Design an enzyme around this catalytic site. Structure first.
Site, PDB file in Angstrom:
ATOM      1  N   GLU A 134     -33.615   1.182   0.669  1.00 43.64           N
ATOM      2  CA  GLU A 134     -34.434   1.826  -0.347  1.00 43.64           C
ATOM      3  C   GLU A 134     -33.728   2.971  -1.060  1.00 43.64           C
ATOM      4  OE1 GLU A 134     -35.190   0.914   2.685  1.00 43.64           O
ATOM      5  OE2 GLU A 134     -37.343   0.705   3.033  1.00 43.64           O
ATOM      6  N   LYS A 188     -44.305   9.971  22.497  1.00 38.37           N
ATOM      7  CA  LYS A 188     -45.272  11.066  22.455  1.00 38.37           C
ATOM      8  C   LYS A 188     -45.923  11.192  23.830  1.00 38.37           C
ATOM      9  CE  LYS A 188     -48.042  14.200  20.803  1.00 38.37           C
ATOM     10  NZ  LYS A 188     -47.488  15.465  20.248  1.00 38.37           N
TER      11      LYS A 188
HETATM   12  N1  LIG Z   1     -24.665   6.577   9.631  1.00 35.60           N
HETATM   13  C1  LIG Z   1     -25.905   6.159  10.289  1.00 35.60           C
HETATM   14  N2  LIG Z   1     -26.264   6.665  11.471  1.00 35.60           N
HETATM   15  C2  LIG Z   1     -27.355   6.305  12.067  1.00 35.60           C
HETATM   16  N3  LIG Z   1     -28.173   5.414  11.530  1.00 35.60           N
HETATM   17  C3  LIG Z   1     -27.896   4.872  10.377  1.00 35.60           C
HETATM   18  C4  LIG Z   1     -26.736   5.235   9.710  1.00 35.60           C
HETATM   19  N4  LIG Z   1     -26.707   4.542   8.581  1.00 35.60           N
HETATM   20  C5  LIG Z   1     -27.795   3.779   8.531  1.00 35.60           C
HETATM   21  N5  LIG Z   1     -28.515   3.977   9.618  1.00 35.60           N
HETATM   22  C6  LIG Z   1     -29.686   3.377   9.920  1.00 35.60           C
HETATM   23  O1  LIG Z   1     -29.771   1.981   9.271  1.00 35.60           O
HETATM   24  C7  LIG Z   1     -30.982   1.927   8.688  1.00 35.60           C
HETATM   25  C8  LIG Z   1     -30.922   1.070   7.405  1.00 35.60           C
HETATM   26  O2  LIG Z   1     -31.971   0.167   7.430  1.00 35.60           O
HETATM   27  P1  LIG Z   1     -32.069  -1.023   6.222  1.00 35.60           P
HETATM   28  O3  LIG Z   1     -33.216  -0.700   5.280  1.00 35.60           O
HETATM   29  O4  LIG Z   1     -32.301  -2.386   6.868  1.00 35.60           O
HETATM   30  O5  LIG Z   1     -30.799  -1.069   5.457  1.00 35.60           O
HETATM   31  C9  LIG Z   1     -31.359   3.435   8.337  1.00 35.60           C
HETATM   32  O6  LIG Z   1     -32.789   3.588   8.252  1.00 35.60           O
HETATM   33  C10 LIG Z   1     -30.870   4.185   9.339  1.00 35.60           C
HETATM   34  O7  LIG Z   1     -31.893   4.397  10.381  1.00 35.60           O
END
Ligand SMILES: Nc1ncnc2c1ncn2[C@@H]1O[C@H](COP(=O)(O)O)[C@@H](O)[C@H]1O
Ligand SMILES: Nc1ncnc2c1ncn2[C@@H]1O[C@H](COP(=O)(O)O)[C@@H](O)[C@H]1O
Ligand SMILES: *C(=O)CCCCCCC/C=C\CCCCCCCC
Ligand SMILES: *C(=O)CCCCCCC/C=C\CCCCCCCC
Lengths: 72, 530, 530, 72
Positions: free
Chosen positions: B319, B429
């Site tokens: 997004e 929680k």
């Molecule tokens: N450098 C990062 N470190 C930790 N989590 C990440 C990182 N980059 C992306 N993410 C996780 O990957 C998710 C991407 O979800 P998506 O919408 O399927 O592309 C993000 O919401 C993050 O929670």
């Protein structure tokens, strides 16, 4: 003699592949047609039948089935 | 459209035809298959425009692509948006039912599909009803894409339209019942390219992408526009190398032969490349991988640094453009030893230019930036999707309170370094306190009798939901829940009840369900267990 | 909304509160469960309005219902539209995945579900994300619907809004990849009630619904508004009987005890009722079933007429209101014997008031009405859905050329009697001629060694697609394809090549796939066979 | 003696129901938990095992299993 024979049986059961083609040389992947989940569940079924306790840490380095067969 | 030539519109054709640098003799390399120059690339883009016009693609049509990382995908990244159509990137890792759902939802007109994905199309071809033509892509002269292009002229006058017309769309498979469609306009993509170039090009001496680099993606290019990196590389006019299907030995050979300097991948691919036996004797001290998939571990970073690789992290999602934050090191931080450098390079990073990021609570109160207080990240940026396509309630929940909720919980340093803890929906929680699951998973994974650790919550009367651990044991170690409980108690540095260890109720379940993205399905585990 | 009292809006509240006749002491009967009068019904509708307002239902919200035929469904048919919300009727016969898809697509807010459908909700409850409240309906005092109504006042001032606001929506599972959503406004429903009342109330002496009838549905009431019959019955102020779950003995007992005179059902239910051992001694000479599900057979009609039942046919679908045509017999046709009357009563019928119907070709050329020329029916009416919800291409194909395509092939008599042959997608195109599959299926079913017959097409080089027959044999009759071929040749009255029997290639497959609606999935059979 | 015993086996196999509860009296429906398609496929499997040729025209009137068992 008999132990190695039945390891060719297990990995052939769930994937529906005959035992002549599926042997020690035949790896966990390709010829069987297994994905990541299929491969890990075959590795688990190995211990659910022969009663080993695979940690997947030996599975990080075995990619030929033969390694596990002899590992037993 | 009324052009008004004094009124400038930010379009992708300006990215292609008004670049920072243009070398007509610079090459575009498809791994061991084809090579051509930027002049040929610009001719083939115009030819593809001619072919798309011939097939009947209007200014509102949708063209879907099922391909690998290749020159064809780079051509589609430009030609389809310039005509005025939307490019729908299909995630080939999804199940065929989800792929069929996304095809039906987006209402595609033409599908460009590689011949190796034909079995996937075989089981969903009947129930499609929108697609009129299928174009089969091949790696030889039998490709129908090549046959259609070599039948057209290399001259085309690209139209001028509003900068707010939609350019690309793809579907994200996050925590929701059905895939959600995000989309972006020409202006947003151009601004994302400009902003990231201004942020990571102006770095003094570390982790900078400049006009002398050689770029090769190791990100599947249908996820988030490959992090917008093909656009940036085309704008810089640098040599581009496309590997196709990702095989570690092929990738290492390409890095050696093509002298690749800049890449982006995920921790699993990087670990595979570093652990490959072919990589032990291969030179690495010119490479600049950026790890942005999820949560670059400290040990992998330390090993990569010991192999003399400029490895750093970045943060984004579907997004958000995607890029929201990048790890940049001040020039005093390159004098630190390998361990402290590894700690610094594993963080989420600081926010990039034109990005506003805060951490809030459920009441949206903008918690302080002290390095300890944790809340959900909410952002504002020039390249965020305004809603989900054909969706109202999830769209309303996405932009609650005037900010975009990323669904991630983090604490921000006093100097601006963000550290993501875990997801919002993974929260634990207990009574009136708030703890993560990832640190508990890592602590239990430090045990010598565990392979994979899953920690989820279990409701209780007085203390509310309590954590529960699901792991798989190791060889000849029939260690029951009592041993894992004792190991957890053996640790220190925890709050809540004593050491927050009073209702763990650790269990051991053999098989852990894993999604199509390789991650464990925590919701399905909850449904099966409770 | 600006009311402008001189400007009249056609709303459903006018159907309820300005009826043709209102008897406050007329009863509403839920089978062996409850009885109350029309005054109590009007009080409970106002109470339901109060409860819906309390739960937070606005003028654009969606309330979904999963129930049987009961007084609660009749109350929902009125209270939810008058508030300004849309009523989403859920087809409980669909698979749970399709039900989940329709719930996600319609974006429902409150779900009213019977306790016997709770297992269906159990497997899709996690992946819903739109519904905030669930109301469980029961057949005893433990019902939450009853508890919510008996906590409100029986006074409510219903708003006045545009007559073009959407009132109801439901999803049709026809020949397409995913279910398609049709919807109707207040004006369309009011006009449908008025038009059908004007058409079937003014009949001289046969098949008329008037103010002295007793109505009981045998149509599941979530399909097409139960053919709009509950609205018409409420407008007439007649006694209404709701059976709940359809059990033949319970239905026969209700018909005997309540003195039911008017019903609507499908051929299978009518055959079950006529074949039940309890029905042989029961009086039937006051009953006026209308058969409108699909293709009332001549033999069942003959048997029903021999049992002295006023049985007649009608035609409609999800997109059409539904009622488009009804069988009406001129008073010279009631002097014919049982066989000719059965032939007349099995037809599709003549079009109802304010309905324009033609038969066209693929070029939309309006074939003549001679009783032999066959083309697709295309209609215009005041109660047709303008498009599919959240759909463009299927919506465009639905209203091609300015008419609504019903997907049915028929020939129209010189006097106006329509005779539907088969579906458009079931057509058999041999070379340059056009034949149906249903007549071939019936001819092969006349064989003494067949249970169910399926006839589908198979492409060929010279003659194009050719028919192929799939049947299941009978006891001790191992009759191969040659015997069925010979039996087909034994017939007469066929065109094309001699007797159109030169490429039949009849086969025998054991299991025939059947959809959730009980019909065979011809597309799936084609996919499995070819 | 033995024929009637194994008819209680077939309809119990596909629906996963034990042979003590599933008997001659136990009908094709309810207690087994079978739909229309499950019932017709059980009726077919009856002839795929005992080699009868059911036309479904006898199945239009049998609703107790016992009728088929004795029909054999
Ligand atoms: N450098 C990062 N470190 C930790 N989590 C990440 C990182 N980059 C992306 N993410 C996780 O990957 C998710 C991407 O979800 P998506 O919408 O399927 O592309 C993000 O919401 C993050 O929670
Ligand atoms: N009286 C009838 N005779 C023959 N077919 C009918 C009759 N009534 C309805 N049908 C068929 O039932 C279909 C309704 O489909 P649906 O949209 O699922 O409600 C129509 O398209 C017709 O083909
Ligand atoms: C698999 O391809 C991952 C895709 C899903 C998650 C999105 C990953 C986040 C995107 C970008 C990370 C930020 C790093 C950008 C690099 C810019 C050059 C320094
Ligand atoms: C199962 O409920 C059938 C629903 C799917 C197909 C729609 C059936 C067609 C609807 C109405 C037929 C016309 C008869 C109307 C009766 C009016 C009183 C004479």
């Amino acid at each position: 003699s008999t132990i190695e024979e039945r390891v060719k049986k297990i990995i052939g059961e769930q994937l529906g592949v005959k035992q002549e083609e599926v042997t020690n040389n035949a790896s966990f992947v390709e010829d069987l047609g297994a994905d990541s989940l299929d491969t890990v569940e075959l590795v688990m079924a190995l211990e659910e039948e022969f009663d080993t306790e695979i940690p997947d840490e030996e599975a990080e380095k075995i990619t030929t089935v033969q390694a596990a067969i002899d590992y037993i | 459209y009324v052009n008004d030539p004094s009124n400038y519109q930010l379009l992708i054709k300006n990215l292609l035809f008004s670049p920072v640098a243009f070398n007509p003799e610079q090459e575009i390399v498809y791994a061991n298959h084809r090579r051509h120059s930027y002049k040929t690339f610009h001719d083939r883009v115009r030819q593809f425009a001619n072919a798309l016009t011939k097939m009947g693609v209007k200014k509102g049509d949708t063209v879907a692509v099922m391909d690998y990382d290749s020159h064809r995908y780079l051509e589609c990244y430009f030609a389809i948006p310039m005509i005025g159509a939307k490019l729908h990137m299909i995630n080939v890792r999804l199940s065929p039912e989800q792929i069929l759902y996304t095809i039906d939802h987006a209402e595609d007109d033409i599908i460009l599909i590689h011949e190796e994905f034909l079995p996937i199309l075989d089981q969903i071809k009947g129930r499609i009803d929108t697609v009129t033509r299928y174009v089969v892509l091949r790696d030889d002269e039998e490709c129908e894409y090549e046959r259609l292009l070599e039948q057209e002229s290399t001259e085309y006058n690209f139209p001028d339209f509003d900068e707010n017309t939609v350019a690309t769309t793809f579907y994200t498979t996050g925590t929701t019942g059905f895939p959600k469609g995000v989309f972006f306009t020409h202006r947003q993509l151009v601004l994302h390219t400009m902003g990231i170039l201004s942020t990571i090009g102006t770095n003094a001496s570390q982790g900078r992408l400049h006009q002398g680099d050689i770029y090769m993606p190791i990100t599947p290019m249908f996820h988030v526009h490959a992090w917008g990196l093909p656009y940036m590389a085309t704008m810089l006019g640098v040599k581009q190398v496309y590997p196709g299907k990702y095989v570690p030995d092929v990738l290492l050979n390409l890095i050696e032969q093509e002298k690749v300097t800049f890449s982006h991948c995920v921790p699993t691919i990087l670990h595979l490349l570093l652990s490959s036996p072919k990589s032990k004797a291969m030179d690495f001290s010119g490479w600049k991988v950026v790890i942005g998939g999820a949560a670059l571990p400290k040990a992998l970073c330390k090993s990569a640094l010991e192999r003399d690789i400029d490895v750093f992290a970045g943060y984004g999602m579907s997004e958000t453009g995607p890029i929201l934050s990048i790890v940049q090191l001040t020039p005093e931080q390159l004098e630190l030893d390998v361990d402290q450098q590894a700690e610094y390079r594993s963080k989420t990073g600081k926010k990039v230019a034109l990005v506003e990021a805060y951490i809030v609570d459920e009441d949206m109160n903008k918690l302080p930036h002290d390095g300890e207080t944790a809340g959900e990240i909410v952002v504002r940026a020039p390249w965020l999707t305004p809603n989900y396509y054909k969706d109202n309630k999830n769209s309303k929940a996405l932009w609650r309170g005037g900010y975009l909720h990323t669904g991630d919980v983090a604490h921000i340093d006093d100097e601006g370094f963000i550290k993501i803890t875990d997801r919002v929906k993974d929260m634990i929680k207990i009574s009136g306190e708030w703890v993560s699951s990832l640190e508990l998973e890592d602590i239990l994974h430090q045990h010598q009798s565990v392979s994979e650790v899953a920690v989820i919550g279990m409701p209780h009367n007085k203390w509310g939901e309590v954590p529960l651990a699901l792991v798989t044991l190791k060889e000849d170690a029939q260690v029951t829940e009592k041993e894992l409980l004792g190991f957890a108690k053996d640790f220190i540095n925890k709050g809540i009840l004593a050491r927050e260890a009073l209702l763990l109720k650790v269990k051991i379940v053999d098989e852990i369900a894993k999604t199509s993205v390789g991650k464990v399905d925590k919701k399905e585990l909850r449904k099966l267990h409770l």
